[PDB]
Amino acid sequence: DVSFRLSGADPRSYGMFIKDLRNALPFREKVYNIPLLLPSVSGAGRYLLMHLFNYDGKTITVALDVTNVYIMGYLADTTSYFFNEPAAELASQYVFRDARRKITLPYSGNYERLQIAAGKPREKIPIGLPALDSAISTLLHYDSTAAAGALLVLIQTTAEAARFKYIEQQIQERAYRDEVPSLATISLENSWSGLSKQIQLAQGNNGIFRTPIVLVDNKGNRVQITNVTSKVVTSNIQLLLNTRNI
Numbered sequence: 001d002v003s004f005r006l007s008g009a010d011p012r013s014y015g016m017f018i019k020d021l022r023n024a025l026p027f028r029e030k031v032y033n034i035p036l037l038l039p040s041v042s043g044a045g046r047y048l049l050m051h052l053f054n055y056d057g058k059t060i061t062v063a064l065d066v067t068n069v070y071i072m073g074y075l076a077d078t079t080s081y082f083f084n085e086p087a088a089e090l091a092s093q094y095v096f097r098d099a100r101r102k103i104t105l106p107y108s109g110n111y112e113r114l115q116i117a118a119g120k121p122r123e124k125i126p127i128g129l130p131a132l133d134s135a136i137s138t139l140l141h142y143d144s145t146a147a148a149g150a151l152l153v154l155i156q157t158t159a160e161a162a163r164f165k166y167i168e169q170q171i172q173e174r175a176y177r178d179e180v181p182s183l184a185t186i187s188l189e190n191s192w193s194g195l196s197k198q199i200q201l202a203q204g205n206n207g208i209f210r211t212p213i214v215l216v217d218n219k220g221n222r223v224q225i226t227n228v229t230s231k232v233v234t235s236n237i238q239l240l241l242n243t244r245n246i
């Protein structure tokens with residue numbers, strides 16, 4: 001497992017947890033120097049367990065699919081909560097097996113669904129480390145509408161930051177203060193599958209992508225990523241979703 005404690009959390013222990021997360025995820029190869037997530041993993045080995053501790057010392061256990069970095073569910077005391085989706089239900093045969101009770105949230109785990117549930121687009125919701133603390137806190141007692149808003153923070157602060165160095169940097173900047181995500185952060189989160197796929201297709205095409213990716217990179221600029229020499233590729237993107245899962 002991987003852990004993180006908000007009490008005494010600075011941009012540094014956060015960098016250490018994010019490094020630790022990416023490192024817990026299996027891969028056999030590197031594509032242009034970026035780890036390539038497995039196509040599949042069978043059994044319980046398919047799920048990573050993340051322990052998050054709020055400022056006060058309370059925790060939740062977050063279940064993660066090692067294949068795509070999608071959050072499956074979480075445990076808060078003796079209750080497990082899972083998204084209403086097949087992968088999460090199958091995830092439930094392998095983890096939080098001793099929870100006294102299991103609740104299925106009234107929504108699946110994609111941004112679109114979580115945003116309808118919360119009543120706000122993630123562009124209008126602040127993230128940072130304080131926001132992570134609040135989210136842990138709120139997932140500790142059930143409220144489906146509020147949980148949706150806390151899942152939107154948690155997902156960006158763990159999964160999205162492990163996928164992109166730019167996003168992990170954004171969070172370290174919001175370590176003592178929250179702030180809505182930039183235009184650029186949203187764009188990256190949304191093109192990960194797109195980009196993951198174009199990097200894979202570029203092998204054998206001289207690093208040239210078959211279909212250009214439109215991104216917004218810092219300062220609000222509307223850019224097109226055409227090949228592997230681009231900065232998003234060489235520096236940013238830290239994990240690639242296998243094309244067999246796109």
Ligand SMILES: *[C@@H]1O[C@H](CO)[C@@H](O[C@@H]2O[C@H](CO)[C@@H](O)[C@H](O)[C@H]2NC(C)=O)[C@H](O)[C@H]1NC(C)=O
Binds near residue numbers: 208226231
């Ligand atoms: C691969 O990547 C770089 C950018 O990361 C591209 O270079 C641009 O190419 C266009 C068209 O020829 C120029 O007008 C730009 O000013 C170049 N920018 C930089 C920063 O180099 C490169 O074109 C891409 N490779 C190919 C084969 O197109």
